[PDB]
Amino acid sequence: SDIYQHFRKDERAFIDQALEWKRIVQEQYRMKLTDFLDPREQVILSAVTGQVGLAFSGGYDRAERKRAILFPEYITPEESDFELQAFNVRYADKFVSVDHRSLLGALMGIGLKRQKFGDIVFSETAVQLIVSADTADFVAAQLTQAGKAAVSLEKIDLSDLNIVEIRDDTVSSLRLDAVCASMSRQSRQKSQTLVKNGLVKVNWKVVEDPSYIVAEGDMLSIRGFGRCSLTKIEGKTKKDKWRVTFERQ
Amino acid sequence: MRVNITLACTECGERNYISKKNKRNNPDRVEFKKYCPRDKKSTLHRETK
Amino acid sequence: KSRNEIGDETVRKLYVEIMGRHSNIILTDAAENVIIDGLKHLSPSMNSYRTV
RNA sequence: GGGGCCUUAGCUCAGCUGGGAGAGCGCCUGCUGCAGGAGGUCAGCGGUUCGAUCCCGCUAGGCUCC
RNA sequence: GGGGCCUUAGCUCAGGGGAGAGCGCCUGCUCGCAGGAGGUCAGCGGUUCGAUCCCGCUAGGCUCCACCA
RNA sequence: AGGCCCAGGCGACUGUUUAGCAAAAACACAGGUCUCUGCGAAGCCGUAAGGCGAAGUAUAGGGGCUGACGCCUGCCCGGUG
RNA sequence: GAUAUUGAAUGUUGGUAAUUGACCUUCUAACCCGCCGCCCUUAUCGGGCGGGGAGACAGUGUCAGGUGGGCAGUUUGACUGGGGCGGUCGCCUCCUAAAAGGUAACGGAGGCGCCCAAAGGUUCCCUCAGAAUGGUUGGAAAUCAUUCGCAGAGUGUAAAG
Ligand SMILES: [K+]
């Protein structure tokens, strides 16, 4: 009841369900695997669960959408308890190209919910996707086209997964509106519109406060400029602006 | 920057000599052949660790 | 039909009045019928019926 | 009291520091917004000189200034 | 009056090593591209191997003081 | 045994105040609001016992600010509480 | 908050070899009642007795941390053409400084709070600035070569010597 204040009002929905997962693992003494919780929902769950222990794995290390195991003080989990299936996306690579937008659009097009798949990995040699094992056969059967490319899915082990723009700058403050303006190369008044409407996120939390102070190692997500990361804050200049470093995706 | 140091007779262990070096210029333990008045002869005296 | 700063679709009306001396080009919001700006301003002192 | 600056058309001020009295606004005219009108001893008075708001003489008045 | 701070390209700001970056403005190309435009680095005189970034002064703009009889 | 009138500032008003240089525009005020307080109330005095609060009980009691009445009382929760 | 006053049980979870911890709930008998009845007793005190409530909590003691101008003791520099404000406070060099030395002012100018493992020691050897004249790049100015050349250079760094 006195947890919601710490999160947003829309985020209440997840928090209610996150409390219902903790309820199970305490009383029934059994691990609860979840449906690839979003990077934000990782942060929320971590809080709602409390310290019921928690584990998280999205197949490869550095998956955005990862599935969480809520386990007690015993039954420390394995890599396959997360019920993850990796696939290699086969297509006529010489003729057609698959991009992240097309493959994401195709996954959604076959009716797959965002919670039923993790990250879509693009390397030089392979395009791979990670899904929940319960949906693996459905996705393999239905995902026959991505954009203009005819595609097929080959099952692989997680071990077979084939896993910047540094921009040293100065800002007046570490307010959100100031950092966005700097990163996105805009007027601050324009950046304030972005923040206020609800287009910027900070670690996948929608921050609508222009004056929110941004810390070192915060993934900002300006809808319109993509995504960028305050990696370094490096003291202050002669004329008193924060020496900073940005790295766009 | 430049720091205080002790040299110590590598024989008898007698902390015989303070001095100064620049650490950036001289980052590894300096040694010199300076008289130990315990031993009563020149010995190598190395910067104390 | 244009987009706003957030990316939402907005419709603007551009009125081009050919009235000699009083000719004007006026941009409005289509939803609110509110003048964004006009190439020539018309104060209430100049015209009691309509302000631009 | 002492210094300082201006007085100009209906109104308000330009005009180089003599080179030949103007603008804006208002007003009067016709047109359909336009041009075109009027209007001054350039505060007044009298020297300079080829012409003087213009140069100086010579008095108003108001401001600047302690 | 005194102190304290400021003066960089159109605009916003980076920056003892020979003055940049974005945006605007121009180049051709149709939400990104592709090269330009533009600087007495307030000024001055000097420290020196070179000064936007030393140092001393002059501007100007802000800021804080100018009290006690 | 009242001088009166016109106009303006301040305070609504009657009250109160620097005994002995200040009576006021200062205080109070009725009204407003905020806040604490479930009763061995909070608050306060006292080391405590014992008290006030109250022989009261949230329409009550304490504290802060505001000050009749009329119209009203905007923006800012980063800082501090 | 720990600990004493402070007990009994039931669970559950530690750690030692069945005892001792931790926490949850329950209990009543300590403790508490500014509740009721009865008595001491003509008594809104107090005490006793019996109910009831609450209960090992609270309260109180010791110890600990936090908060704490509510209160207490204090501190809050000197120079200074009055004090405040500004500036300054130790060290080095020069000038003032009156041809020994010393010498004041909120007198005139600058430095310092290091640096260097060689920029120290010694041995041997050497001579600098700049200019003229000639030179592919190459220019006033890089690199040669020639002549001239008390130093017009250099001496880690301020200045003087
Ligand atoms: K004096």
Domain ranges of chain B: 1-48
- Residue B31's SS3 state is strand
* Residue A133 · residue A74 · CB < 8 Å: no
Give the residue among A238, A237, A225 at the shortest CA–CA distance from A246: A225
Expt. technique: cryo-EM
C and B make contact (3+ CB pairs below 8 Å)? no
* Residue B30 · residue B43 · CB < 8 Å: no
| Closest A-chain CA to C8 | A197
Q: Which residue matches tokens 């650490």?
A: B23
- Residue A104's SS3 state is helix
E strand map for A113-225: 117-122, 127-132, 145-146, 149-156, 166-171, 201-202, 205-206, 218-222
Please enumerate residues of A whose Cβ is less than 8 A from a Cβ of C.
190, 193-194, 197, 199, 223-224
Resolution (in Å) of the shown entry? 3.4
CB contact under 8 A, C6 and A190: no
Phi-psi region of C33 (alpha: psi -120 to 50; beta: other; left: phi over 0): left
Contacts of A225 (CB under 8 A, 6+ apart): A183, A184, A248
Asked if C7 is an interface residue toward chain A (Cβ–Cβ < 8 A), one would say yes
